[PDB]
Amino acid sequence: LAASLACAL
């Protein structure tokens, strides 16, 4: 989940 947020942004 953490990585997904950073990736999306």
Side-chain angles (χ1 to χ4, degrees):
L1 288 156
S4 81
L5 173 62
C7 179
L9 288 163

